[PDB]
Amino acid sequence: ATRDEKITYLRKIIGDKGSDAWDVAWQEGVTPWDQGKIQPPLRDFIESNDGKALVNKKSDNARVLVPGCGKGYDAAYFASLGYETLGADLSSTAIEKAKEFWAESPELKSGKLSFQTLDFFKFEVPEAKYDLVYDYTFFCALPPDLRAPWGARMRELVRPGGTLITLVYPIDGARSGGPPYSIDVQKVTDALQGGKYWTKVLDIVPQTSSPDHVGRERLVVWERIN
């Protein structure tokens, strides 16, 4: 019942079952990551002018992908802004949980918001790709040997000139624990760039962070270049 127990039990299935351990933890209720809401830094950036420039540039077909959406809080936020948003998670339970949590959302009924059980590493990239991708508590969930494929998949999922927002969390330092892995902007930079493929347009410390997130989180905005 203790959070530390739930993390220890979670890290035990990931060692025994691997990627299939995520749907196991979702249906078993062991979801110590679920905060019920989007992180404040995401809203403040979008409502800022540095973020406004992206929301006003938004075309009438701007597509947003939220890998590892969980219950799809961030995905529902981007749909509320007018984006054709897709929430993708490996767990079919989580996708079913997101569809209940946002059942009354006008965007789920209209189709702007969509929740699908997809594999970030396996699903077919749409031809038009994605104008924006948001990664929170997904890169830090992947084991270290999957970060390079993560950045490789991000290079093809984001269209040229598109945006990849990465809320780097948790920035805990030398903590060698499993999920959630301690990450920094450097680890995200190495995975994304294999000035090769991306441009770090913004790297900021969020003004309004969750209290447990203070000092362990940075919002980084990447642009896909040629």
Ligand X SMILES: Nc1ncnc2c1ncn2[C@@H]1O[C@H](C[C@@H](N)CC[C@H](N)C(=O)O)[C@@H](O)[C@H]1O
Question: Which CB atom, from 51 or from 180, has the smaller least distance to ligand A1IRH?
Answer: 180
CB of 143 to ligand A1IRH, least distance (A): 11
Alpha helices in 58-169 (DSSP H): 73-80, 92-101, 106-110, 147-157
- Should residue 180 be labelled a site residue for ligand A1IRH when binding is judged by CB under 6 A? yes
32 binds, among ligand A1IRH, ligand X, none (CB under 5 to 8 A by kind): ligand A1IRH
Angle at 65 between CA 186 and CA 115, to 5 degrees: 130
Judged by CB under 6 A, the residue of 33, 101, 130, 134 near ligand A1IRH is 33
- Shortest distance, position 3 Cβ to ligand A1IRH, whole Å: 6
183-212 binders of ligand X (CB under 6 A): none
Stretch that binds ligand A1IRH, among 54-62, 101-109, 133-141, 213-221 (CB under 6 A): 133-141
CA angle 129, 167, 198 (to 5 degrees): 50
Place of tokens 């569809």: 99
* Residues belonging to the chain: 226
Binding test (CB under 6 A) with ligand A1IRH, winner from 85, 137, 163, 166: 137
Choosing from 77, 78, 102, 136, the residue that interacts with ligand X (CB under 6 A) is 136
The upper half-sphere exposure of residue 215, i.e. CA atoms within 13 Å in the direction of its Cβ, equals 4
91 is a contact residue toward ligand A1IRH (CB under 6 A): no
Nearest to 224, CA basis, from 39, 54, 50: 54
**Is 198 within 8 Å of 224 (Cβ atoms)?**
yes
Would you count residue 22 as binding ligand A1IRH (CB under 6 A)?
no
Which residue number, 22 or 78, has a Cβ lying nearer to ligand X?
A: 22
Selected binder of ligand A1IRH within 66, 75, 141, 192 (CB under 6 A): 141
Q: Binding pattern to ligand X, positions 27-46, x when CB under 6 A?
A: ------xx------------
Question: Strand 198-204 to strand 84-89: parallel, antiparallel, or no bridges (unpaired)?
Answer: unpaired
Contact 64, 75 (CB under 8 A): yes
Q: Where are the beta strands (DSSP E) in the chain?
A: 63-67, 84-89, 113-117, 130-136, 158-168, 198-204, 218-224
Residue span binding ligand A1IRH (CB under 6 A) among the ranges 76-84, 137-145, 153-161, 182-190: 137-145
Which residues form the interface with ligand A1IRH (CB under 6 A)?
A: 7, 32-33, 137, 140-141, 179-180
